[PDB]
Amino acid sequence: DNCPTLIEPVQTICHDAEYVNVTAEDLDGHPNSGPFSFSVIDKPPGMAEKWKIARQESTSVLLQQSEKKLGRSEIQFLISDNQGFSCPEKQVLTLTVCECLHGSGCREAH
Amino acid sequence: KEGIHFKSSVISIYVSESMDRSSKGQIIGNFQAFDEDTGLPAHARYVKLEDRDNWISVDSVTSEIKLAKLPDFESRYVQNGTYTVKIVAISEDYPRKTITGTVLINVEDINDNCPTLIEPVQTICHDAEYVNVTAEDLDGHPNSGPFSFSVIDKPPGMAEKWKIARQESTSVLLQQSEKKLGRSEIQFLISDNQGFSCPEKQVLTLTVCECLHGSGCREAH
Structure with a gap:
């Protein structure tokens, strides 16, 4: 009856990083769980897609850049729990x- | 039958010093008193002694202890990285009884100070070529360490005229290549190890x- 969330949704990263890792948490869990599904958002063009996904694990995700620029950007998400x-x-x-x-x-x- | 006693003669806490973001209103603990014969809690009124800079406050109705200043690691009252305040708690109805205790709070360093040019001015002779200027930082190591000194790229060619030629942990030795009996204006840029x-x-x-x-x-x- 609860949905996954992002737990540090405002995060700094090093200049020389090419990947970023972020965890998600859900208010409710096992038994009614499994691995989460992560996706990001690509529409509209030129504006939305600053990051994409490289690896995914049960409770955390590993992201990679689209144009590799430096500075402030938002990353729009779609996350669902198992059920x-x-x-x-x-x-x-x-x-x-x-x-x-x-x-x-x-x-x-x- | 005997009056009020403490469960600990001294209490001890740790904190960071301040720069820029420090929180007001800070609580650190309690100082409860007990019957010596059974250890059931008693009530007392509380007073503060020898707080040298006013860092601490006390609430009698809880024996709680609370901060009233921002901590500074360079403070003239901070010794070995510690600050002390004394408490006394005193009873009611006769016979009235006084019992003593102490608060020890420990304070860690932040790099809140910056190296400045302590030697703004010098006068120099016609056979000399080298001149020494010191900086000072008001933190200790790590928060000072070996300084880095530089002199800026303006006006054109000033690196041919006056330059850094050796450097120490506290200080720098300039040299001259201008070879002239006048004035020069020598902007430094200067960091600490952090x-x-x-x-x-x-x-x-x-x-x-x-x-x-x-x-x-x-x-x-």
Whole structure:
């Protein structure tokens, strides 16, 4: 009676990254579960498709760029749980970039 | 039969210092009192002692303890990375009894300070070629470490005129190739090991002159 969600839907990533990983969570689960289905959105042209999918696992997804640009972009999602319940909330991600140096860490100052 | 006692003589907590985003209103714990004979909770009224900078507050009705300032790791009252406050809790109806305790809060460092040019000004003789300027950062390591100094690419050709020629953890030695008895204006850019640099400018005023043997600049006035 609940639908999957994105758990950090505002995420920074390193400049030199070519893949991004994000988890989804669902308010309800096993027993009534299996692996989730992830898809993104490609319509309209020139505007929608900044990211696409490369790998998918039960509870998380691995994304890859379409034009490889740097900065602020939205990634519009379609996510269903196994048995397929639907809710009026729209599923989304927003991504932006930092210059990384301290491993994963943004080099920036306070 | 005996009066109020503490379940711990001292309590100890940890936190980060402040820069920019720190939360107000902060709670850290309680200081409950008990009958010594059975350990069932008693009531007391509470007072604060020797808070040297006003960081802490106390609520008698809960024995709770609460923060009233933002923490600073460079503070003149912070020692070994710790700050102390003393509490006393005191009973009601006769005989009245006082019992003492302490709060220890530990504070970690942020790179909230930036290296500045402590040596804005120097005067230099006609046989010299090298001049030394120091910076200072107000954090310790890691939050300072070996500094990086540079001097900017404007005006055209200034790298032929005055340049960095050796560098230390705190400091830099300039050289000269202009070979002239006047003024130069030497903007530095300057980081600490973590990459932080001041929003404000850092510039050396430097005067080169003709000098007497073993003395400053020449004088006809």
